mmCIF file of N, CA and C in Angstrom:
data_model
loop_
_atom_site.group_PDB
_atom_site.id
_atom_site.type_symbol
_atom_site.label_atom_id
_atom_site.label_comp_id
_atom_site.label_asym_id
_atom_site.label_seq_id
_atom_site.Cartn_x
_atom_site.Cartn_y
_atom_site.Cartn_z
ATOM 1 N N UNK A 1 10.248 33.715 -11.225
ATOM 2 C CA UNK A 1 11.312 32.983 -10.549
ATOM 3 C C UNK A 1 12.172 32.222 -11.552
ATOM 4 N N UNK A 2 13.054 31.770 -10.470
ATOM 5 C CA UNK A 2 13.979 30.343 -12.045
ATOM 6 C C UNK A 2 13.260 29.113 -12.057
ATOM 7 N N UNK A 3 14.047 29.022 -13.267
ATOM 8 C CA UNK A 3 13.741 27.517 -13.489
ATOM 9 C C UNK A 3 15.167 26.629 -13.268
ATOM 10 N N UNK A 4 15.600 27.012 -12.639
ATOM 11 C CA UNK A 4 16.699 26.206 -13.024
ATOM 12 C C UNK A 4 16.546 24.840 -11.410
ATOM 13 N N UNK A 5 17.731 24.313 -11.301
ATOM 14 C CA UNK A 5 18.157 23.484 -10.274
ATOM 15 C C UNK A 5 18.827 23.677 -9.159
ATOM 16 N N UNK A 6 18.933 23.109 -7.956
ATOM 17 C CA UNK A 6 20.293 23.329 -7.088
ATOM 18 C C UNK A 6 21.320 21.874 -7.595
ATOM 19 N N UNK A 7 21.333 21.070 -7.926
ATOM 20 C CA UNK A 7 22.158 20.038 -8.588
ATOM 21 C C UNK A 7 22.771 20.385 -9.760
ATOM 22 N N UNK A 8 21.952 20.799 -10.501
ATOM 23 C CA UNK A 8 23.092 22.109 -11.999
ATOM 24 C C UNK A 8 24.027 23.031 -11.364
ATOM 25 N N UNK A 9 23.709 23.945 -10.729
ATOM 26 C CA UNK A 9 25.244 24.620 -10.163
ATOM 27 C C UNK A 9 25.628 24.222 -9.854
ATOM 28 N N UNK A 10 26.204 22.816 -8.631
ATOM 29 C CA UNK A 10 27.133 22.563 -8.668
ATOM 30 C C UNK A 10 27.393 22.071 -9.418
ATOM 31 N N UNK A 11 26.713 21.714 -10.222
ATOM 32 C CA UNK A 11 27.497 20.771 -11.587
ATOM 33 C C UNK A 11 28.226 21.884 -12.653
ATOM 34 N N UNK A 12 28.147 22.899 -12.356
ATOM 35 C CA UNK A 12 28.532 23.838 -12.844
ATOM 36 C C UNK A 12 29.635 24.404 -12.382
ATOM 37 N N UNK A 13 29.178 25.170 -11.132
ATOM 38 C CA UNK A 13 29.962 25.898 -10.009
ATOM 39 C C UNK A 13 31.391 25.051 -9.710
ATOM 40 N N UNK A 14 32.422 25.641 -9.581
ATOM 41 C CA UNK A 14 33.478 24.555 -8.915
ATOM 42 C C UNK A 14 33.951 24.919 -7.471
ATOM 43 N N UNK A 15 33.477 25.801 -6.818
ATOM 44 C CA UNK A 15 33.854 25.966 -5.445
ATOM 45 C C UNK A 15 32.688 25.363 -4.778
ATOM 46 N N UNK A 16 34.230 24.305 -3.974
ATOM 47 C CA UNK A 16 33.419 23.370 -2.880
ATOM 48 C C UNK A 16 32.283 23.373 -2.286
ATOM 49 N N UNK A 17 32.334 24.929 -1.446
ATOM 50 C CA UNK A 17 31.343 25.401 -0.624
ATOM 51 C C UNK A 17 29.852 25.407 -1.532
ATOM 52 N N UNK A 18 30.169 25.795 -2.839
ATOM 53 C CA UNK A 18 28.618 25.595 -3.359
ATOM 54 C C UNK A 18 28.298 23.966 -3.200
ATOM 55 N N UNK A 19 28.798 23.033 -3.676
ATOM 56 C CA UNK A 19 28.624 21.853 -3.702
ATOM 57 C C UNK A 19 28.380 21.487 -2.329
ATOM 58 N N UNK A 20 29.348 21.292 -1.037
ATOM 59 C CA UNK A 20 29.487 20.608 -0.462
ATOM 60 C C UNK A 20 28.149 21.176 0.330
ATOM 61 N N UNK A 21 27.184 22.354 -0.047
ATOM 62 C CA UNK A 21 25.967 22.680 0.674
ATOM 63 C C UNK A 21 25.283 22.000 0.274
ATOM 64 N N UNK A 22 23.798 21.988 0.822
ATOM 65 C CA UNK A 22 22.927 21.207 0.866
ATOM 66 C C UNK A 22 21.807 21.361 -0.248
ATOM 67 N N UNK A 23 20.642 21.150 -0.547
ATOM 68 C CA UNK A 23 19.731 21.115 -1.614
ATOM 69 C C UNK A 23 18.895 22.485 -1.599
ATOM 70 N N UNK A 24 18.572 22.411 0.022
ATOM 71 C CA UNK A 24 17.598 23.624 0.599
ATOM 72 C C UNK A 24 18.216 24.502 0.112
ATOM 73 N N UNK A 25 19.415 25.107 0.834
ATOM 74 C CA UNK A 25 19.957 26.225 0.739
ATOM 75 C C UNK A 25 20.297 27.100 -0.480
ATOM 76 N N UNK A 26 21.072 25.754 -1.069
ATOM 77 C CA UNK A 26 21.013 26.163 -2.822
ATOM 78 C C UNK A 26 19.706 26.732 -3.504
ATOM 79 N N UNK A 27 18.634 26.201 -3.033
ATOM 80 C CA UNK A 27 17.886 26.796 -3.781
ATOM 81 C C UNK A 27 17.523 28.690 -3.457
ATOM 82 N N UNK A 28 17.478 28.809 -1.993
ATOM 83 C CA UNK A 28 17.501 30.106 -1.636
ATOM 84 C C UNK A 28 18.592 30.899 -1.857
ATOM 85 N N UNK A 29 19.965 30.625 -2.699
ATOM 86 C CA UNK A 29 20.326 31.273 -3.733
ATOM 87 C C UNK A 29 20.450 31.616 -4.947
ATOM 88 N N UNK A 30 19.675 30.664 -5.055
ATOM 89 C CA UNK A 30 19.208 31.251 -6.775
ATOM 90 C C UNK A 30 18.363 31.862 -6.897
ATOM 91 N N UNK A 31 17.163 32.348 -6.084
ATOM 92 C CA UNK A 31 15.967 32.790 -6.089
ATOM 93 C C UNK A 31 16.676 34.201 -5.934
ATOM 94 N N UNK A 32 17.903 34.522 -5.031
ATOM 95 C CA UNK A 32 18.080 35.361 -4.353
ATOM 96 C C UNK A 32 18.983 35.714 -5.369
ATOM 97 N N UNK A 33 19.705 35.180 -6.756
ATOM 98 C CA UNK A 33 20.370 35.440 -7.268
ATOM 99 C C UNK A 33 19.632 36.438 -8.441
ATOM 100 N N UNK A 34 18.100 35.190 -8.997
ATOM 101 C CA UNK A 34 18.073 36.243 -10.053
ATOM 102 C C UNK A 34 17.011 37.241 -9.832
ATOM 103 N N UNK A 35 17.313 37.355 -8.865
ATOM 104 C CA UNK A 35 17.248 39.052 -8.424
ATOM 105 C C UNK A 35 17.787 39.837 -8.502
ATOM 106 N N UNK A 36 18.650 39.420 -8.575
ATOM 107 C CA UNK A 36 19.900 40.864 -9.267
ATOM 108 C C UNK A 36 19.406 40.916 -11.155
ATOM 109 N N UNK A 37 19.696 39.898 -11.344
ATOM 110 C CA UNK A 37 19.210 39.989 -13.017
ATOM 111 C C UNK A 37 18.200 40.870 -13.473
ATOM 112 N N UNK A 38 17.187 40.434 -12.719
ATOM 113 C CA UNK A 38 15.743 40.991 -12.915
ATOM 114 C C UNK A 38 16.015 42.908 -13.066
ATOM 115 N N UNK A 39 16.211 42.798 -11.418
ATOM 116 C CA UNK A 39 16.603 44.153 -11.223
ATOM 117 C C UNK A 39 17.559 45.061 -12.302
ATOM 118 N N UNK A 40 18.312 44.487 -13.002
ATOM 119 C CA UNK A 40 18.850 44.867 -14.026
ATOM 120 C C UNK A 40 18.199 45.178 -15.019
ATOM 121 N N UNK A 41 17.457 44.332 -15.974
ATOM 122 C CA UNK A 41 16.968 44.557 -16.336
ATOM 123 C C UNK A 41 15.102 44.900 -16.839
ATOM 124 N N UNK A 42 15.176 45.397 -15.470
ATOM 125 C CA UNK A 42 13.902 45.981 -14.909
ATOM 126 C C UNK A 42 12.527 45.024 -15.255
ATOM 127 N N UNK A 43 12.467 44.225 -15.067
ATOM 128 C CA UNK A 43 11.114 43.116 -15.353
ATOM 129 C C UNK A 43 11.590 41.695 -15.098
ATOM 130 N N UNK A 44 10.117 41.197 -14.821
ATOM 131 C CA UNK A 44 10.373 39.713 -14.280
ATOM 132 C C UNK A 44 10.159 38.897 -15.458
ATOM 133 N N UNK A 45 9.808 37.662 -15.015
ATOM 134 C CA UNK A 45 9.123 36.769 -15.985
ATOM 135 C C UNK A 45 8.088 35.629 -15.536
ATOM 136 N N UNK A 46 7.323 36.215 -14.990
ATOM 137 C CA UNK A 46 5.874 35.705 -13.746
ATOM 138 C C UNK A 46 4.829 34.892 -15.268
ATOM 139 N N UNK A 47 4.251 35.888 -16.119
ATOM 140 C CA UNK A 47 3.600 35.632 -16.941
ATOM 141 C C UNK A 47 3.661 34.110 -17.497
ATOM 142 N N UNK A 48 3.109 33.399 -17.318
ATOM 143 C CA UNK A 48 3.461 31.874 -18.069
ATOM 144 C C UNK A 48 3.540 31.692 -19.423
ATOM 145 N N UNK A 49 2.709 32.787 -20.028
ATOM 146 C CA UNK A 49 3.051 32.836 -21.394
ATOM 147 C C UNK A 49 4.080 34.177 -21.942
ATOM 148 N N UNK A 50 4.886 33.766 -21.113
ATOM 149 C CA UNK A 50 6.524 34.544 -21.710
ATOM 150 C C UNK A 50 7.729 34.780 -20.877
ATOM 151 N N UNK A 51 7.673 33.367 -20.342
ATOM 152 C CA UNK A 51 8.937 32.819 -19.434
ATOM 153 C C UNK A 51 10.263 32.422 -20.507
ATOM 154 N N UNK A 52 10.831 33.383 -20.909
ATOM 155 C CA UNK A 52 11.732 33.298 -21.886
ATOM 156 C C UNK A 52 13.064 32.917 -20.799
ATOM 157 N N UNK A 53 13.862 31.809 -21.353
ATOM 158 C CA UNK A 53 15.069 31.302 -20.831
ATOM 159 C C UNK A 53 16.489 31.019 -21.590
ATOM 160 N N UNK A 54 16.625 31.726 -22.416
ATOM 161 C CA UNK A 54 17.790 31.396 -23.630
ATOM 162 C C UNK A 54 18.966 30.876 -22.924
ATOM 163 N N UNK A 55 20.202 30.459 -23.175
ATOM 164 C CA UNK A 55 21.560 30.035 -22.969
ATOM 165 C C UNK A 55 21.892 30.918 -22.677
ATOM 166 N N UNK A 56 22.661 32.485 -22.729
ATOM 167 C CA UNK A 56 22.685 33.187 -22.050
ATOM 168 C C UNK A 56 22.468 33.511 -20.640
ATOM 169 N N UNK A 57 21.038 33.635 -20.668
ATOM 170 C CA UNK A 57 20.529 33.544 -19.161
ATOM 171 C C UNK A 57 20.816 32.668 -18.305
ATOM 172 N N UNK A 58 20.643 31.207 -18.329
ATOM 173 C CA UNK A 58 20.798 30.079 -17.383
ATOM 174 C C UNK A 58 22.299 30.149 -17.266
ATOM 175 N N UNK A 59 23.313 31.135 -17.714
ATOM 176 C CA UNK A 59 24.577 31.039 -17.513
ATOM 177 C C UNK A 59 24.712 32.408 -16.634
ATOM 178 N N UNK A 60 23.997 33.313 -16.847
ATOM 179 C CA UNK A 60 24.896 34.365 -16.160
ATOM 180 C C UNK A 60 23.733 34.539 -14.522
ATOM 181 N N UNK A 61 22.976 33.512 -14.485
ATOM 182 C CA UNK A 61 22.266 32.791 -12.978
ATOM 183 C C UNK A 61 23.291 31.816 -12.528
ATOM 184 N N UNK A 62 23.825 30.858 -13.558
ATOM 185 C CA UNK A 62 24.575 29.754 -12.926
ATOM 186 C C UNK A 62 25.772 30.784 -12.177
ATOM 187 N N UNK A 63 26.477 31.866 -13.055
ATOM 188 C CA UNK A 63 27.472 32.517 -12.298
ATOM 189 C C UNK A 63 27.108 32.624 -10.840
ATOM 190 N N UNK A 64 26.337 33.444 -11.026
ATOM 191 C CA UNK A 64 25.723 34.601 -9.740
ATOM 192 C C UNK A 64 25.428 33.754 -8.971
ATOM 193 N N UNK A 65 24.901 32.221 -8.675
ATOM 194 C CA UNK A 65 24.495 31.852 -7.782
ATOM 195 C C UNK A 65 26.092 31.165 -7.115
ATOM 196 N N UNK A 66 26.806 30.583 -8.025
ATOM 197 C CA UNK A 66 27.909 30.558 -6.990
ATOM 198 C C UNK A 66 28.583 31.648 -6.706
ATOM 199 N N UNK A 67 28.330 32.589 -6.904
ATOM 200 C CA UNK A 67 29.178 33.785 -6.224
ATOM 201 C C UNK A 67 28.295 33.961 -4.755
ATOM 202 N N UNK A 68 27.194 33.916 -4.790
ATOM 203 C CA UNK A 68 26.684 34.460 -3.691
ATOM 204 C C UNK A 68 26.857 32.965 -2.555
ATOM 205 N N UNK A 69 26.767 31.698 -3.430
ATOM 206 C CA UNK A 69 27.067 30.688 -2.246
ATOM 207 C C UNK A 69 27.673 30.475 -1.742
ATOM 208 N N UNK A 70 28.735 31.001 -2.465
ATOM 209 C CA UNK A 70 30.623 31.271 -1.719
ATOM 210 C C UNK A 70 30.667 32.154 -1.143
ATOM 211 N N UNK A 71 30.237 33.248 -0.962
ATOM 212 C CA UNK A 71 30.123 34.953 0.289
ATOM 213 C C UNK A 71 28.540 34.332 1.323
ATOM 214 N N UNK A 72 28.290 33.663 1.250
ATOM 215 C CA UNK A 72 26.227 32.749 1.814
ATOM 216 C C UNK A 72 26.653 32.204 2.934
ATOM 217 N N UNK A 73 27.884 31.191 3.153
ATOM 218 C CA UNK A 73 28.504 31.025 4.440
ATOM 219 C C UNK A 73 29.966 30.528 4.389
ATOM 220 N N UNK A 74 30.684 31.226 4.342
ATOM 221 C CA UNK A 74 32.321 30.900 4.075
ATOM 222 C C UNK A 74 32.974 31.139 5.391
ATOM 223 N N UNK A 75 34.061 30.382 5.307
ATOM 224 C CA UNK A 75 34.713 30.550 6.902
ATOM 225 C C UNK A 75 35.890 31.736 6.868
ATOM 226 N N UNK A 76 35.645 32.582 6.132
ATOM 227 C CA UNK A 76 36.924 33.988 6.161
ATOM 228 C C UNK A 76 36.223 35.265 5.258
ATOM 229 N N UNK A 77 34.812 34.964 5.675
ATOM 230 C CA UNK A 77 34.625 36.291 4.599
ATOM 231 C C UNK A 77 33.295 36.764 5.795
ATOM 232 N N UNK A 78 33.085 38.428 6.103
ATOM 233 C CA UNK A 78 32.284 38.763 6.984
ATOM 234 C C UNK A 78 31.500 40.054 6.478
ATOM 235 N N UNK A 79 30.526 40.715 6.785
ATOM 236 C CA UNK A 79 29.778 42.021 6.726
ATOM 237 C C UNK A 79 30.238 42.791 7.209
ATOM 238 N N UNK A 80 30.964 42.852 7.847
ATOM 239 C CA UNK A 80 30.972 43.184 9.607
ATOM 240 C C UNK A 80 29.247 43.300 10.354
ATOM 241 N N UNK A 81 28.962 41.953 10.209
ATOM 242 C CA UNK A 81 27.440 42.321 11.009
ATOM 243 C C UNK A 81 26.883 42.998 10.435
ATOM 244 N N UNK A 82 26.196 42.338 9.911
ATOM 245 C CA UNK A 82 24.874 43.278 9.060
ATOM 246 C C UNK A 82 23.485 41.922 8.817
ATOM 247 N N UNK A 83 22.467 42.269 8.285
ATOM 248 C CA UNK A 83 21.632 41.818 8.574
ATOM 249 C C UNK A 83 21.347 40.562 7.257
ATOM 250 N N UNK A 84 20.813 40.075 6.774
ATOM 251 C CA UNK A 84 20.751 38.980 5.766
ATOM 252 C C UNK A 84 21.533 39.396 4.470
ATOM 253 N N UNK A 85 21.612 38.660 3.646
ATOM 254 C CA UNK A 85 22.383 39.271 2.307
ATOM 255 C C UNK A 85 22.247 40.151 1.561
ATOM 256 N N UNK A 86 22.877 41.208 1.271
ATOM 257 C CA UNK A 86 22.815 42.709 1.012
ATOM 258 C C UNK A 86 23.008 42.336 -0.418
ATOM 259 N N UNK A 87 22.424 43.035 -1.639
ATOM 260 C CA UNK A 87 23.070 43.349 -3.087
ATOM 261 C C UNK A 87 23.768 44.685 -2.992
ATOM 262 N N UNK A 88 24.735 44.728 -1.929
ATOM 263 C CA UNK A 88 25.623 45.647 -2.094
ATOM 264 C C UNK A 88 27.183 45.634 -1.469
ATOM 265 N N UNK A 89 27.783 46.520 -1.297
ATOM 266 C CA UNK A 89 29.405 46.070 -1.157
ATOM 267 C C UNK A 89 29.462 45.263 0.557
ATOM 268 N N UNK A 90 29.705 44.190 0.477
ATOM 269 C CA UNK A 90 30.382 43.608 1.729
ATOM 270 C C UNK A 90 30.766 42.724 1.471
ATOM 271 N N UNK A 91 30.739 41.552 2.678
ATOM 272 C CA UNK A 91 31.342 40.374 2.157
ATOM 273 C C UNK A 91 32.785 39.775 2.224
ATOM 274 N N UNK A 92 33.646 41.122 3.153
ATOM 275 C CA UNK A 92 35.207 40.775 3.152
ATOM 276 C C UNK A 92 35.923 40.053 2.619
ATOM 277 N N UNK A 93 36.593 39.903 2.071
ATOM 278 C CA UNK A 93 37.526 38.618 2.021
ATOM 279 C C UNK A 93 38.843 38.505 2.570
ATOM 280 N N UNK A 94 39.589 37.228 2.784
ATOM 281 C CA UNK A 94 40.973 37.108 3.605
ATOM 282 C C UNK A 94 42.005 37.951 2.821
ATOM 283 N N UNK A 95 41.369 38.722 1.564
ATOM 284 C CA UNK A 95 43.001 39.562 0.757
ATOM 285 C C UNK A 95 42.408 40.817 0.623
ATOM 286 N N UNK A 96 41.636 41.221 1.997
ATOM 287 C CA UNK A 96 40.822 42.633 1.710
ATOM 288 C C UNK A 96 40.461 43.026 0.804
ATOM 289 N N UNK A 97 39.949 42.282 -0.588
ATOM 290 C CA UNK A 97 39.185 42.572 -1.714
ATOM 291 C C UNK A 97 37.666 42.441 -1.443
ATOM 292 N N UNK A 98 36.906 43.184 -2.050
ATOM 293 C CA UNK A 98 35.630 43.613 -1.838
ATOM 294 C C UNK A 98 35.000 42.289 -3.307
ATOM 295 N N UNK A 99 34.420 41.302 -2.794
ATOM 296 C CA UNK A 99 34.271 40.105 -3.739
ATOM 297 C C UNK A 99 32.921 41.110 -4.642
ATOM 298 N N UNK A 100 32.960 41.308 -5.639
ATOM 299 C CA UNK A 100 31.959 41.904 -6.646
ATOM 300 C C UNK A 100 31.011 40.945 -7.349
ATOM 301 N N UNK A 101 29.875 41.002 -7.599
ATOM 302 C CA UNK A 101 29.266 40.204 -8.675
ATOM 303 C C UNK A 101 29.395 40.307 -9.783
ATOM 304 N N UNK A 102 29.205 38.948 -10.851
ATOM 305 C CA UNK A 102 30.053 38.662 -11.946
ATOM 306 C C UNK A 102 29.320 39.243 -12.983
ATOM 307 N N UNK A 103 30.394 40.426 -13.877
ATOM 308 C CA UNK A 103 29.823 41.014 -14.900
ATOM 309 C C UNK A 103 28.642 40.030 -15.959
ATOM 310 N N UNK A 104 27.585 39.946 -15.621
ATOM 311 C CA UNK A 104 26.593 39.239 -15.955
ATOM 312 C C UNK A 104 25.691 39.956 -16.531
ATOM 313 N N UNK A 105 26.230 41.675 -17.106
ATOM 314 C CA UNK A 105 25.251 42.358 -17.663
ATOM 315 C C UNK A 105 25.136 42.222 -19.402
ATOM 316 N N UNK A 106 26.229 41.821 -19.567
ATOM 317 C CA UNK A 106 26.358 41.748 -21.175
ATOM 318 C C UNK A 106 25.497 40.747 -21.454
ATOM 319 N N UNK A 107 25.081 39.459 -20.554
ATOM 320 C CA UNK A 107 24.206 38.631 -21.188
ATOM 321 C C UNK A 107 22.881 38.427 -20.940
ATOM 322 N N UNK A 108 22.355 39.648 -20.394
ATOM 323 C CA UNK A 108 21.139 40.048 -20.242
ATOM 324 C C UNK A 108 20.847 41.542 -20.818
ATOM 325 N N UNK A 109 21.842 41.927 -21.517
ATOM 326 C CA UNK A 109 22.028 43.001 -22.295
ATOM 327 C C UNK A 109 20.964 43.022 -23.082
ATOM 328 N N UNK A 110 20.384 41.817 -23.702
ATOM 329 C CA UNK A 110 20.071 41.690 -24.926
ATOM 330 C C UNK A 110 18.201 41.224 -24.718
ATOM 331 N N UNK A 111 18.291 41.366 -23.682
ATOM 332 C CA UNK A 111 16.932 41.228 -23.030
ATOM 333 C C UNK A 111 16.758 42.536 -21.604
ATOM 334 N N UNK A 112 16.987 43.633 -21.938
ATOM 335 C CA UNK A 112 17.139 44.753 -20.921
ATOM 336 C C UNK A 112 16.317 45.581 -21.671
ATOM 337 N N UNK A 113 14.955 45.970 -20.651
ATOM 338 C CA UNK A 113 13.790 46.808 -21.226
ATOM 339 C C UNK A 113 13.756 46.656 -22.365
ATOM 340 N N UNK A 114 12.829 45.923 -22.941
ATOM 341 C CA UNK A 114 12.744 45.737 -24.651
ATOM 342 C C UNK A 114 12.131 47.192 -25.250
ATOM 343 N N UNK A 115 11.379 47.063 -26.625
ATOM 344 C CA UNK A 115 10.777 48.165 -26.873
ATOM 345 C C UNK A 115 9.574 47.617 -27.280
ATOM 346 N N UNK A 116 8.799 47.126 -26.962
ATOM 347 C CA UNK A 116 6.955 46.348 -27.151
ATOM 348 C C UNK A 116 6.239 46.878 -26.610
ATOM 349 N N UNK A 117 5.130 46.983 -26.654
ATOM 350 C CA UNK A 117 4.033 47.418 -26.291
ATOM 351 C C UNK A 117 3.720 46.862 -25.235
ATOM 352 N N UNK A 118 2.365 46.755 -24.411
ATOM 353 C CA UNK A 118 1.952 46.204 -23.429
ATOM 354 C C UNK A 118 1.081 44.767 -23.870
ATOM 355 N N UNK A 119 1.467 44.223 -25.068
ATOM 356 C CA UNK A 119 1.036 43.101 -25.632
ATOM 357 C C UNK A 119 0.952 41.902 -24.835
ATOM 358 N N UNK A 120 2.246 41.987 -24.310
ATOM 359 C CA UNK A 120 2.453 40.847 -23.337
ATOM 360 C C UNK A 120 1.242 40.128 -22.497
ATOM 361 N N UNK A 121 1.355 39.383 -22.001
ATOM 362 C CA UNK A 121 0.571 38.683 -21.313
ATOM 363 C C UNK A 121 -0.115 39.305 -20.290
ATOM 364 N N UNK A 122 -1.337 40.292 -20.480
ATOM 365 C CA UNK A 122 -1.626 41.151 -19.669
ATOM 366 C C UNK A 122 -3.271 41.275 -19.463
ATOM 367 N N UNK A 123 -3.699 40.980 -18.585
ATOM 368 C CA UNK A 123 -5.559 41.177 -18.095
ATOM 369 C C UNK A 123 -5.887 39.814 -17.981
ATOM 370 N N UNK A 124 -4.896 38.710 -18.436
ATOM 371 C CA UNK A 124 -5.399 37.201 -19.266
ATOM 372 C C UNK A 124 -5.701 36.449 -17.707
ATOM 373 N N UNK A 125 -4.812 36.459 -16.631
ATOM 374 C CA UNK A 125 -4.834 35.659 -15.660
ATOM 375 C C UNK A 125 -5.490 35.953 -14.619
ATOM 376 N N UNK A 126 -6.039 37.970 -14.412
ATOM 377 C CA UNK A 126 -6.641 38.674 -13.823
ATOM 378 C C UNK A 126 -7.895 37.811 -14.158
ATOM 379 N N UNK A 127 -8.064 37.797 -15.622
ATOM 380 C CA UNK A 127 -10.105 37.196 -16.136
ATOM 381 C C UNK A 127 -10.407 36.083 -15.590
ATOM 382 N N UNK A 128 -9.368 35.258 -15.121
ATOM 383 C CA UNK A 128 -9.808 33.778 -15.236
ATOM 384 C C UNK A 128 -9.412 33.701 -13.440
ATOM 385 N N UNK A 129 -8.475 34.230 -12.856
ATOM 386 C CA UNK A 129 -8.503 34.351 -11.204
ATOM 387 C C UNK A 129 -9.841 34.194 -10.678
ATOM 388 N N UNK A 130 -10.027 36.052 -11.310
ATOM 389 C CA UNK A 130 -11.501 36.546 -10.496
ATOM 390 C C UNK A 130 -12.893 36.469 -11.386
ATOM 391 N N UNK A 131 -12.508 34.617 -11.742
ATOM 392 C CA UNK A 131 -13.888 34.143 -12.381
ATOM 393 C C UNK A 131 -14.750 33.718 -10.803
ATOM 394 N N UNK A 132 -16.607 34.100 -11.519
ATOM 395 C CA UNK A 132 -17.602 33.520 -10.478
ATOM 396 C C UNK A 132 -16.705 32.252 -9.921
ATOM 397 N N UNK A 133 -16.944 31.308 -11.102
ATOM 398 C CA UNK A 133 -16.458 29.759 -10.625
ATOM 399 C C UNK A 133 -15.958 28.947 -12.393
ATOM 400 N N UNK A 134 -17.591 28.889 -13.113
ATOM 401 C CA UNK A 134 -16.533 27.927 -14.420
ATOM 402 C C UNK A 134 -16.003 26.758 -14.416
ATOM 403 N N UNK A 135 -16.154 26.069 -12.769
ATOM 404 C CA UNK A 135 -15.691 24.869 -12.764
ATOM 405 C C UNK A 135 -16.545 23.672 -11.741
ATOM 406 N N UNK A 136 -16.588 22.271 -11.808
ATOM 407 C CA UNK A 136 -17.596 21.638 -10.979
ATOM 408 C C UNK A 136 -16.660 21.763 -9.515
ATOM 409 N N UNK A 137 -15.954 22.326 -8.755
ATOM 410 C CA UNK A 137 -15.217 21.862 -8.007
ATOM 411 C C UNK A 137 -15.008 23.056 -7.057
ATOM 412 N N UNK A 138 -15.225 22.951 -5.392
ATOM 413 C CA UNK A 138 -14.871 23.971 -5.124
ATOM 414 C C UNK A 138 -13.752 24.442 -4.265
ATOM 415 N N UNK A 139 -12.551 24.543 -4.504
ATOM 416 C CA UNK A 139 -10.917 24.057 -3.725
ATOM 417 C C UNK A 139 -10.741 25.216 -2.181
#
């Protein structure tokens, strides 16, 4: 998931509608944003030991999340009826332009399928999940 904030985009974002929304909501677009990222470049970043976040990244999330908070509930832009938010063409707008998401690939370019091995953080959280116990406490 992100790390980021719903109080940073708008501090970022300059359309109203991102701001003038609420805390909740903001956050269920960013979650929903870097999902597109991910999907791009095919992997998450779940592993705790390799939640990589460079300047780059926290910018081309800050984009994407006001794009989607501005098409999320605007008073002139529609699906025509369709079901929750699509990552694909809708979204109308009042000058019949098809609102696109923001070329945000160049800065995840550089983190798109690396070439490493399976080094990564892998079997480590499986061992210690599905431990007997290891601890005085039982939650």
């Amino acid at each position: 998931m992100l790390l980021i904030t719903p109080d940073e985009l708008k501090s970022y974002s300059v359309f109203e509608s991102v701001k003038t929304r609420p805390d909740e909501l903001l956050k269920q677009d960013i979650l929903e944003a870097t999902a597109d990222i991910i999907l791009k470049v095919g992997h998450d970043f779940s592993d705790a030991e390799y939640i990589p976040l460079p300047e780059t990244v926290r910018l081309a999330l800050l984009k994407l999340s006001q794009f989607y908070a501005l098409i999320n509930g605007d008073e002139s832009i529609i699906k025509g009826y369709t079901t929750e938010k699509i990552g694909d063409y809708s979204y109308t707008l009042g000058d019949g332009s098809s609102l696109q998401k923001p070329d945000v690939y160049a800065l995840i370019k550089d983190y798109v399928k690396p070439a490493d091995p399976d080094l990564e953080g892998i079997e480590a959280k499986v061992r210690m999940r599905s431990i007997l116990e290891h601890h005085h406490h039982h939650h």
